[PDB]
RNA sequence: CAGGCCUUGACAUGCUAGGGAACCCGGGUGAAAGCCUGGGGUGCCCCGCGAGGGGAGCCCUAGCACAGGUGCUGCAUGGCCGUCGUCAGCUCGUGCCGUGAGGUGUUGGGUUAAGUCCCGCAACGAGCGCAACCCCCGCCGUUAGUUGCCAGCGGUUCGGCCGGGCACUCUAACGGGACUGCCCGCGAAAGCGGGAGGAAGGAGGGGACGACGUCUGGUCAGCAUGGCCCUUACGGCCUGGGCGACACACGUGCUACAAUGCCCACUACAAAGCGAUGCCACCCGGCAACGGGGAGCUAAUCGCAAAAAGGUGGGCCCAGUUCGGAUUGGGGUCUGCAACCCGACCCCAUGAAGCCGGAAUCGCUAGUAAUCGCGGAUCAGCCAUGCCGCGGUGAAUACGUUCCCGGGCCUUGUAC
């Protein structure tokens, strides 16, 4: 989660396959989801803070 | 331990989302990212004004930002110039003709975030922790506010050992859904590290 | 012959918008098919509550989309101009297809 | 520290209005200035401690009327500040509490100027 | 393995050097880092110093080893 | 980790000099990264007839504040989480007792999942707790009928296919309903046994919800932050290797050891999801994975999608076997710049161990265990037999608390 690593993911790496996904909030690349572009921790925090429209605690 | 977020527990009922808009999977991420950026910029800037809440609305290729402030005098300025440049800033950041709005919070003693930042500033100014907490809880209790609770994290008075202080009075039923408990967290930075302050305020039922 | 799509995250505002549209159309001459409820779509996200370990925590979150349908029949010109003019609530999303 | 009801009486005897401005000298903690801000329009404070100032910076955070000037009361151009800050108020009062030793010289200066 | 439609893959930077060396006399100990390339009939009988991870190991190209890859003849882990 | 490179720089905010002042395409050396070196360029104002300039954003060079660090400290911290434990307990106000520390409440009898409730009682309450308020499943009703459905009609090239209709299922929103509510009997009451009406009967079945605190619990490698440490290196850029090694041991699982079975054909019945640089119907080539053509779908319409155990017919006849498919040799396909280390899948070839498993030990009380299949996240592809969900078939047994483990409350001896 080094800075240099953060900017390294924002350039076309000469081939398609080298490209990947980083969290847009903390720069994690271990639990990021395509839909939100956030890691699980950031997703949970933002969901709890109520800053995600329509996202709510699930129970069934 | 490990109590859950009191706001996230009541998203469905008695509390409402901060961001209110619809977007498909195609463009959810972009809208969320720009919303986060807007919130970051506004929280960085308007801190002096006593920020409460930032509501983001979208209708059709446009953004309607509502800002809850203790004292609108700071945000607006001497003849409504400050807001203008502020608007321009957002207009420069995301080119979708945002429409800034300001709302003043009635009796600022009944807003958990404001109490949070107040106590955080007190901590930052090397105040006495316990006395400040009692004062804060009493002040909240004076203005109705059927319940009040304030918690400080640790590292009290630059000590070597961290410890929670905690103080409350009134009814704070964290376990009931129909509670409408307002929640606020603030972080204080001092020469000897970081402190976390949490404030819950209980206002009626149903 | 005109179909009206209502998509939302909050069912209450969606119902309010659908009610407004149906009422306005009904006032404006010709009859309508009426609000047709559609099966809501659910996305689910299971995460670990902990930031490091304890993979037995797994808090849940859901994102649900609610759907409507209006299907105005026998379109009227002044009815048409009545549409695209009424300001919709912020959360609700509208679509028009013939 | 003084009883909270007496200060009300002094402020009443100042016949403070929502339109008038006040110059307050030596707020200290900031009892007086608080009970002014309410009924007053613009409060200016000349105060030099750096010790009770954090307390004072806090106590006045609610209000937007009060302002603090970190300048010597005696080593100040009172004309300059009075014209600069108060371009809007109709009338101006001065209500303060003085710290014994230097009480006569301040009043003498304000009157001779 | 290979799709057999797009042909056997060989690095251009190595193939070019091999062919030009073939055309003009001979040279020994051609150092390379390509672990991915495949043996071709155009470099049979030569020697390649392939980088296995710490130092180039010499490998002598025979006829029989035509169908295989460069790197497999270069050990990557030393046991005992 | 080995090797080859760079030093206000991969990234941010500011000064002092010069300038080719947004910069646009080539050539060498190389594994690239880089290092040099070529041709066309000024795209904004003011000024000066113009020539020239006064200047902007604007990239280079040299220096300045600097940035940067997955370096150390989780025994300096925030935040977040785990466990005791969803155990039932932890306190306060006023009043009473005692000179006081303090006690009562919170003890005693009974009953609950529960400090749940009743009675007694010098206490009456209240707060955080439990319960309830919230969500799903189960019955019914009112608005609403398209992409859903088809009972009664007319056609149908007989498939809801058309015309047609919201009766029924469904689909969503709002409500009703369960409250020991009615009766008999037993108790001083909380309650208990048995009935009736009801879809459901005595917290209807699950979920979300974690008290004051304990464990100097876990995380400085999500993030934020205090103090030390490095800044031609502990920073940064590329190639290759490694994280996947292997005399051995341990944990969690998958597939089996067969006849309640195995294999091959035909035929049925689900839910919950996902998909526009994706799903991919159908036709053709190939035994095949797949390739070529090629409609339709921002989706109750189209597709993934074949559901599998199940049923019917045929074969196998106790054999390391038509059990099992490990291991190994070839031939291919797909993704990807690139399948040796180290991908998946297809076809041919071979066919290991394994005859129900010591001491010991785990899970489960009903739609549960056991058993069968499907979907999603991530994802170019995938080592996923993992994780989170969905449905199909569907049991056995609880006499009792002696003993094993772990808790709660009430009683007694020696230290703070
Ligand atoms: Zn993150």
Secondary structure class of D51 (helix, strand, coil)? coil
| Structural domain total, chain A | 1
Report the 10 Å Cβ neighbour count for D100.
5
Specify the DSSP class assigned to residue D20: -
Secondary structure class of D14 (helix, strand, coil)? coil
CB B179 within 8 A of CB B204: no
Residue B132, class by beta-carbon neighbours within 10 Å (0-12 exposed, 13-18 middle, 19+ buried)? Answer: buried
Which nucleotide's C1' sits nearest to the alpha carbon of C59?
A: F208
Interface partners of E (3+ CB pairs, < 8 Å)?
Answer: none
Q: What are phi and psi of D19, to 5 degrees?
A: -105, -25
| Structural domain total, chain C | 1
**B51 DSSP β-pair partners:** B69
Which residue has 């955070």 as its token pair? D61
Residue B28 CA to residue B34 CA, distance in Å, equals: 10
> Range of A59's domain?
1-60
**DSSP states along chain B:** --PPPTTGGGTTTT---SEE----TTTHHHHHHHHHHHHHHHHHHGGGG-EEEEEEEESSS-EEEEEEES-HHHHH-TTS-HHHHHHHHHHHHS-S----EEEEPSSGGG-HHHHHHHHHHHHHTT--HHHHHHHHHHHHHHS--SEEEEEE-S-GGG-SS-----EEEE---TT-STT-EEEEEEEEEETTEEEEEEEEEE----
Specify the DSSP class assigned to residue C88: P
Specify the DSSP class assigned to residue E71: G
Of A25, A50, A57, the CB nearest to B18: A50
**Interface residue B153 vs chain D (CB under 8 A):** no
CB contact under 8 A, B22 and C7: yes
Tell me the CA–C1' distance in angstroms for B126 and F258: 79
Handedness of CA B117, B121, B126, B131 (dihedral sign): negative
Q: Where is E58: in which H helix or E strand?
A: strand E56-60
Residue B91 CA to residue D57 CA, distance in Å, equals: 34
Q: CB within 8 A of B28, min separation 6: which ones?
A: A35, A36
Is D28 known as a binding-site position? no
Secondary structure class of C28 (helix, strand, coil)? coil
Token pair of B153, please? Answer: 């994290």
Which nucleotide's C1' sits nearest to the alpha carbon of B155?
A: F77
Interface of B with C (CB under 8 A): 2, 20-22, 57-59, 64
> Range of C12's domain?
1-98
C33-39, long-range: CB < 8 A, 24+ apart: C33/C69, C33/C70, C33/C71, C33/C72, C33/C73, C34/C70, C34/C71, C35/C68, C35/C69, C35/C70, C36/C68, C36/C69, C36/C70, C36/C71, C37/C67, C37/C68, C37/C69, C38/C67, C38/C68, C38/C69, C39/C67
C-alpha torsion angle, residues A35, A38, A39, A42 (rounded to 10): -130
Specify the DSSP class assigned to residue E72: G
Tell if B198 CB is < 7 Å from nucleic strand F.
yes
Cα–Cα distances in Å, from C7 out to B22, B49, C18, C69, C95?
A: 8, 37, 10, 9, 8
Which nucleotide's C1' sits nearest to the alpha carbon of E17?
A: F30
For B153-188, give one letter per residue: b (16+ CB within 10 A) or e.
bebbeeeeeeeeeebbeeebeeeeeebbbbbbbbeb
Packed helices B28-45 and B82-93: angle between N→C axes, nearest 10 degrees: 150
Q: Which nucleotides of F are covered by protein (CB under 7 A)?
A: 1-2, 10-11, 31-33, 68-70, 76-84, 126-136, 143-147, 171-174, 206-216, 218-219, 221-227, 235-243, 245-247, 272-276, 298-300, 331-341, 343-344, 377-380, 387-390
Token pair of D78, please? Answer: 């009172």
Tell if A28 CB is < 7 Å from nucleic strand F.
yes
Experimental method: cryo-EM
| Structural domain total, chain D | 1
Angle at B106 between CA B185 and CA B176, to 5 degrees: 50
* Closest residue (Cα, C1') to F31: E33
Specify the DSSP class assigned to residue C60: E
**Interface residue B118 vs chain D (CB under 8 A):** yes
Q: Label the pairing between strands D21-25 and D92-94.
A: parallel
Provide the terminal-to-terminal Cα distance of chain D, rounded to the nearest Å. 31
Residue D47 CA to residue D32 CA, distance in Å, equals: 14
Token pair of D63, please? Answer: 């209000």
Strand F close residues, chain B 9-48, CB < 7 angstroms: 9, 12-13, 24-26
CB B156 within 8 A of CB B126: no
Number of H helices, E strands in chain D: 5, 4
CB C88 within 8 A of CB C21: no
Q: From the CA of A32, how far away is ligand 1's center (Å)?
A: 8
Residue D13 CA to residue D32 CA, distance in Å, equals: 13
* Closest residue (Cα, C1') to F236: A4
Pick the residue from chain A with its C-alpha nearest to C50: A41
The full set of domain ranges for chain B reads 16-106, 107-206
CB contact under 8 A, B125 and D58: yes
Nearest alpha carbon to residue B177 among B44, B11, B63: B11
Q: What are phi and psi of D88, to 5 degrees?
A: -125, -35
Pick the residue from chain B with its C-alpha nearest to D65: B73
> Range of D98's domain?
1-113
Tell if A31 CB is < 7 Å from nucleic strand F.
no
CB contact under 8 A, A57 and C65: no
Number of H helices, E strands in chain A: 2, 1
Shortest Cα–Cα distance, B11 to chain D (Å): 30
Nearest alpha carbon to residue C97 among C78, C79, C62, C72: C72
Report the 10 Å Cβ neighbour count for E80.
2
Tell if E52 CB is < 7 Å from nucleic strand F.
yes
Residue D71 CA to residue D92 CA, distance in Å, equals: 20
CB contact under 8 A, B22 and C88: no
Residue A43 CA to residue A46 CA, distance in Å, equals: 5
């Amino acid at each position: 989660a080094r800075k240099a690593l953060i900017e390294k993911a924002k350039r076309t790496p000469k081939f398609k396959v080298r490209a990947y996904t980083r969290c847009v909030r903390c720069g994690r690349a271990r639990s990021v989801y395509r839909f939100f572009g956030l890691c699980r921790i950031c997703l949970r925090e933002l969901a709890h803070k109520g800053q995600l429209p329509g996202v709510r605690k699930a129970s069934w | 331990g490990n109590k859950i977020h009191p706001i996230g527990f009541r998203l469905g009922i008695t509390r409402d989302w901060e961001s209110r808009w619809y977007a498909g999977k195609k463009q959810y991420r972009h809208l969320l990212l720009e919303d986060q950026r807007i919130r970051g910029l506004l929280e960085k800037e308007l801190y002096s004004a006593g920020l409460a809440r930032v509501d983001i609305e979208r209708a059709a290729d446009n953004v309607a930002v509502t800002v809850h402030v203790a004292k609108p005098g700071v945000v607006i300025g001497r003849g409504g110039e400050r807001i203008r440049v502020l608007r321009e800033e957002l207009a420069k950041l995301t080119g979708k003709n945002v429409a800034l709005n300001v709302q003043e919070v009635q009796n600022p003693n009944l807003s958990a975030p404001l109490v949070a930042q107040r106590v955080a500033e007190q901590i930052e100014r090397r105040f006495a922790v316990r006395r400040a907490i009692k004062q804060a809880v009493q002040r909240v209790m004076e203005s109705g506010a059927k319940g009040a609770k304030v918690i400080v994290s640790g590292r009290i008075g630059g000590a070597e050992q961290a410890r929670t202080e905690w103080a409350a009075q009134g009814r704070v039923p964290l376990h009931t859904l129909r509670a409408n408990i307002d929640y606020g967290f603030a972080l204080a930075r001092t020469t000897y590290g970081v402190l976390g302050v949490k404030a819950y305020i209980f206002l009626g039922e149903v | 012959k005109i179909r009206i799509k209502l998509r939302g995250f909050d069912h209450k505002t969606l119902d309010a918008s659908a009610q407004k549209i149906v009422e306005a159309a009904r006032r404006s001459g010709a009859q309508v098919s009426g609000p047709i409820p559609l099966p809501t779509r659910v996305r689910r996200f299971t995460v670990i509550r902990g930031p490091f370990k304890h993979k037995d925590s797994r808090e849940h979150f859901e994102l649900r989309t609610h759907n409507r349908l209006v299907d105005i029949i026998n379109p009227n010109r002044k009815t048409i101009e009545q549409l695209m003019t009424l300001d919709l609530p912020t959360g609700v999303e509208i679509e028009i297809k013939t | 520290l003084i009883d909270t009801n007496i200060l009300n009486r002094i402020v009443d005897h100042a016949e403070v209005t929502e339109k008038t401005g006040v110059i307050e000298i030596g707020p200290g903690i900031g009892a007086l200035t608080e009970q002014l801000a309410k009924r007053a329009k613009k409060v200016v404070a000349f105060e030099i401690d750096q010790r009770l100032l954090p307390i004072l910076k806090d106590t006045l955070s609610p209000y937007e009327n009060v302002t603090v000037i970190h300048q010597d009361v005696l080593k100040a151009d009172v004309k300059s500040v009075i014209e600069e800050q108060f371009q809007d108020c109709d009338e101006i009062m001065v209500v303060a509490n003085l710290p014994y030793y230097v009480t006569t010289p301040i009043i003498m200066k304000l009157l001779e100027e | 393995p290979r799709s057999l439609k797009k042909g056997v893959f060989v690095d251009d930077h190595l193939l070019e050097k091999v062919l030009e060396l073939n055309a003009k006399g001979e040279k020994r100990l051609i150092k390379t880092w390509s672990r991915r390339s495949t043996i071709v009939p155009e470099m049979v009988g030569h020697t390649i110093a392939v980088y296995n991870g710490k130092q180039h190991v010499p490998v002598y190209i025979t006829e029989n080893m035509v169908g295989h890859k460069l790197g497999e003849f270069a050990p990557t882990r030393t046991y005992r």
